[PDB]
Structure formats: structure tokens, C-alpha cells
Amino acid sequence: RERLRLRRDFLLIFKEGKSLQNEYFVVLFRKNGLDYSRLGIVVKRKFGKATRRNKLKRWVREIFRRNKGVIPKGFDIVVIPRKKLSEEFERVDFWTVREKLLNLLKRIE
């Protein structure tokens, strides 16, 4: 699968894509002309130090990978955690994060 390079495509997705959000996530998305969707994760430095940002990224990649069947195909998708998720990240359970992220991803059109 062609890799989604945020170093090359974040600006394009931000300028030409659409956006959805809830309490925990902003999701930016753009049709990619492919028969599959691709994930990028953009974590602001203030979310936490590297190990914490890496745990968030791991959770998001797991949610995406393990539930690819319900995610609309043909989009480049950028997931951005919000301040409220940073604040609750030490307490929140993975399954709640999963529910909130999949709620958004299923509404991509």
C-alpha cells in the first residue's frame, strides 16, 4: 500500500479536505483516489512527552487497523487528539477512545 506521507500531504489535506470532530478528536479527510483509506496521526507537542504521544498513536493505529471493515474506503484520514483527550488520557479506557474515534470515522463521506 502506498504510504501516506504527512510531511508531503498534511497541508493539502488541511486546505482541500473536510473535517469532523467530537470531544476527543478532530479528523481531517480528503478523497485519495485509491481503493483503501490511509491513516495519519498528528499529535501536538503539548499532548505530552514522546512516550505518551506514542501511546496515543498506538491506540489510534490499533483502532484503525482492527476495525478497517467499518471505515469508509478511499480517504486520506488525519487524526488529531484534542485537549480534552490529553486531560483525560491517564484515566480513559481504550474502548471509550475506540468508540469515539470510530463514531467519527464512520461519518466520513
**How was this entry determined?**
X-ray
Cα 27 from chain centroid (whole Å): 6
Enumerate the domain spans of the chain: 1-109
Q: Identify the sign of the CA torsion 41, 59, 31, 19.
A: negative
Strand, helix or coil for residue 19: strand
- Fold of the CATH domain 1-109: Ribosomal Protein S5; domain 2 (3.30.230)
Resolution of this model in Å is 1.5
- Classify residue 107 as exposed, middle or buried by CB count within 10 Å of its CB (0-12, 13-18, 19+): exposed
Neighbour tally for 90: CB within 10 Å: 8
- CA 107/CA 93 separation, integer angstroms: 22
